[PDB]
């Protein structure tokens, strides 16, 4: 007999809205286990590190700061 | 019987042996060396047999560098067992060989004796080989 | 050596970043053993809307390094900010304790009429 044979259900993480797309306030942009992306202007952060839009506009990805963090923001 | 002292995992996937040996295909320790021209698998017993043959021929008058180490475990099913019920048990260890891989180098012996030793060693190996010498570049 | 200033800037970082995130006009203060300084800076953090310090001619000849000077600087920065048109600000203590001369400057600015 084998001692293996277990796995967990999928979690369907990932980028939901890509750069250049138009969003409405409340739209989820990124599902992520940790902060692979950080929240920029007009973007909020949930309790499970989800990134969501807090205004209507156009999504933009960038890299900024002294730590080289990846940021996502919404331009109005 | 070369074998890793410790491994992070016991059993590994079969994989696919493709490509040429861009790394490890230049003479770097000795002056003359034997390198494979065809891909295949080299077992620890084969490595030991070739080393013993070379050492016996050269009468330990120089240094032998072995540039192949078998670190990939190979499993087998017990015998008279059906398919399934988990992966088999580890049986022996191999090193993946790509064309261009240098296997042995010799330092400090005459070229004729070295070539005789390499010719004796090549008969123990499961793939075709060739002889190379150190060049500037 | 240099640890004192680095620690002060480390304390200031959190408040400065939160003020930037809120997007409010910032009233930044700075303190030295000899003088005090205050600036009103825009939300983007690039342009100085107003300033006032003991280096100004009206206060430079005085004791210039105590609570009495700080109250005058607070009143003066309040007047200049009101003239420039700023009403609501977020106070930035730049890692200093909200106490003594800094507190006096803040109270004087509030009396002058900056809502915070």
């Amino acid at each position: 007999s084998t001692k293996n044979g277990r796995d967990s259900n999928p979690k369907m993480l990932g980028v939901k809205v890509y750069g250049g797309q138009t969003v409405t306030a409340g739209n989820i942009i990124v599902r992520q286990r940790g902060t692979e992306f950080h929240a920029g202007a007009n973007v909020g952060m949930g309790r499970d590190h989800t990134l969501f839009a807090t205004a209507d506009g156009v999504v933009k990805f960038e890299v900024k700061g002294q730590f080289g963090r990846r940021y996502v923001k919404v331009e109005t | 019987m070369l074998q890793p002292k410790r491994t992070k995992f016991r059993k590994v996937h079969k994989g696919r042996n493709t490509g040429l040996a861009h790394r490890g295909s230049t003479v770097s320790f000795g002056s003359i060396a034997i390198k494979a021209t065809e891909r295949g698998r080299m077992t620890a017993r084969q490595i030991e047999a070739a080393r013993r043959t070379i050492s016996r021929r050269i009468k330990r008058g120089g240094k032998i560098f072995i540039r192949v180490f078998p670190d990939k475990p190979i499993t087998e099913k017990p015998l008279e067992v059906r398919m399934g019920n988990g992966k088999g048990n580890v049986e022996y260890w191999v090193c993946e060989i790509k064309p261009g891989k240098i296997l042995y180098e010799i330092e400090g012996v005459n070229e004729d004796l070295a070539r005789e030793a390499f010719a004796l060693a090549a008969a123990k190996l499961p793939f075709k080989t060739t002889i190379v010498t150190r060049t500037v570049m | 050596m240099n640890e004192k200033k680095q620690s002060r800037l480390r304390r200031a970082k959190s408040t400065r970043l939160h003020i930037r995130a809120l997007g409010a006009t910032r009233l930044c203060v700075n303190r030295t053993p000899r003088h005090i300084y205050a600036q009103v800076i825009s939300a983007d953090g690039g342009k100085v809307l107003a300033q006032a310090s003991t280096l100004d001619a009206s206060l430079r000849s005085g004791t210039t390094g105590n609570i009495e000077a700080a109250t005058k600087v607070g009143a003066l920065i309040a007047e200049r900010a009101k003239a420039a048109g700023v009403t609501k600000v977020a106070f930035d203590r730049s890692g200093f304790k909200y106490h003594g001369r800094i507190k006096a400057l803040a109270d004087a600015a509030r009396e002058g009429g900056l809502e915070f």
Binding site: - | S25, K35, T37, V136 | -
Partner: protein
Amino acid sequence: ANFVLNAQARAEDKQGKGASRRLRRESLVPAIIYGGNAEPVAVTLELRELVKALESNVFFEEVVEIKVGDKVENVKIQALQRHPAKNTPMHADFKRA
């Protein structure tokens, strides 16, 4: 003067993977010349000539003359690529000197 390599110009249509493989099937060797005060120049050499030159050690220390057309470049061999299995030379880097 001791070492002279006759070369042809390697135009843009003779660059890339397919063109290089065609050249090596035609028994030529692509090579690049770079160095101070000028722009890189791509040339093609003869495999026979290159192997003959590499058989001698003083080729790796002397200044050699690469002639393509009328122009002449005085260069030193800088890098060499070999086939991992067959040891055949495949590409060369020359530095102006």
